[PDB]
Amino acid sequence: HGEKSQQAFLRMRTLNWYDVQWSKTTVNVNEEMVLSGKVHVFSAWPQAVANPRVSFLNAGEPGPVLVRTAQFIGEQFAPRSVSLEIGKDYAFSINLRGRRAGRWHVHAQINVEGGGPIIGPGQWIEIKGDMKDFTDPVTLLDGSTVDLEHYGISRVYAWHLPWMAVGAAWIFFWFVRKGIITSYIRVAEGKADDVIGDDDRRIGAIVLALTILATIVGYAVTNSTFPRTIPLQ
């Protein structure tokens, strides 16, 4: 939507969009629309923009108002970066899915590694429905189906929030057991040994042992679940 501010000669001498079509102008939540088109890579690629040798196909929209279920370019499924050869023409298609109700301006966009964003034609998409009715869903290798809108968030909360609470409890325990002004004065008066000294170190070592045990137990427990995982592709 900000393509107006980009320099004119770079806009007209990098990518030449044509045959750009939007399958539907008005879409519902959980309804699929396809944005497709063809793009021509200018033969006289500017020196300012790096080579399109590393580039990514993207849908230019104000946030994830439309969830991208699949996108293709050059007759290839392209969830990762792709190479565009100078002077060639490529056909692309993005399968979008309505997520947020409203009127959104959705562009076709390709990003070059050393150049930045190149924004193609954009069309107003009207989305009707409610956000809470949105489900992706996706299927795992084992055959189970999950909803990416909500999957994994509960586990992340259940692992993160308790540890933040534990840290806050540790801070408040040491703050109430020894005051800030009180301990500062104590340390400044030479006696910075009755401010912290076993049984204080015993409490610290108990906390550390419990933390290590929880980390090991948590790591082992989350290895029983999801026993077969793969690195980021």
Partner 1 sequence: ESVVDLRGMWIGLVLLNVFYLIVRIYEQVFGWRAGLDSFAPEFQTYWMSILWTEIPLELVSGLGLAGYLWKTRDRNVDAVTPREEMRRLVVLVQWLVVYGIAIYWGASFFTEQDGTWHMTVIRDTDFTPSHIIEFYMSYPIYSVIAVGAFFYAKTRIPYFAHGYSLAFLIVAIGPFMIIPNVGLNEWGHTFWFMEELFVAPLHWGFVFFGWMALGVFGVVLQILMRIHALVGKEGVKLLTE
Partner 2 sequence: AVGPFNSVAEAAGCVQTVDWMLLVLLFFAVLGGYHVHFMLTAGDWDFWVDWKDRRMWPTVVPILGVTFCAASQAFWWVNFRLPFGAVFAALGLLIGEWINRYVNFWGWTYFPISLVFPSALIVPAIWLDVILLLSGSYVITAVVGSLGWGLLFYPNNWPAIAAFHQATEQHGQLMTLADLIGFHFVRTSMPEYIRMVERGTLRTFGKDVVPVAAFFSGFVSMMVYFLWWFMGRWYSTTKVIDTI
Ligand X SMILES: CCCCCC(=O)OC[C@H](COP(=O)(O)OCC[N+](C)(C)C)OC(=O)CCCCC
Q: Which of residues 100-139 bind Cu ion (CB under 5 A)?
A: 105, 122
Nearest-approach distance from CB 115 to partner 1, in angstroms: 6
Give CA–CA dist 69/110, Å, rounded: 17
Give CA–CA dist 122/59, Å, rounded: 10
Pick the binder of ligand X from 69, 139, 145, 215 (CB under 6 A). Answer: 215
Q: Does 138 bind ligand X (CB under 6 A)?
A: no
Radius of gyration of the chain (CA): 27
Nearest-approach distance from CB 215 to partner 1, in angstroms: 27
End-to-end CA distance of the chain: 30
- Please spell the DSSP secondary structure of 47-62, one letter per residue: SSSPPTTSEEEEEE-S
Q: Does 185 bind partner 1 (CB under 8 A)?
A: yes
Pick the binder of ligand X from 8, 43, 176, 219 (CB under 6 A). Answer: 219
Q: Which of residues 126-185 bind partner 2 (CB under 8 A)?
A: 131, 136, 138-141, 146, 148-153, 155-157, 159-160, 163-164, 166-168, 170-171, 174-175, 178-184
Nearest-approach distance from CB 87 to partner 1, in angstroms: 22
Choose the contact partner of 105 out of partner 1, ligand X, partner 2, none; CB within 5 to 8 A by kind.
partner 1
Helix 200-224 / helix 153-177 crossing angle, nearest 10 deg: 180
Q: Kindly tell me which of 192 and 216 has the beta carbon lying closer to ligand X.
A: 216
Query: For residue 83, which of 113, 63, 108 has the smallest C-alpha distance?
Result: 113
Contacts of 210 (CB under 8 A, 6+ apart): none
Site size for ligand X (CB under 6 A): 3
Q: Does 201 bind partner 2 (CB under 8 A)?
A: yes
Pick the binder of partner 1 from 46, 79, 87, 114 (CB under 8 A). Answer: 114
The three-state secondary structure class of 17 is strand
For 194, 195, 207, 213, 225, the CA distances from 199, given in Å and listed in that order, are 11, 11, 13, 21, 39
Q: Does 160 bind partner 1 (CB under 8 A)?
A: no
Q: What does the binding site for partner 1 look like in residue numbers (CB under 8 A)?
A: 1-5, 50, 60, 62-63, 102, 105, 109, 111-117, 119, 181-182, 184-186, 188-189
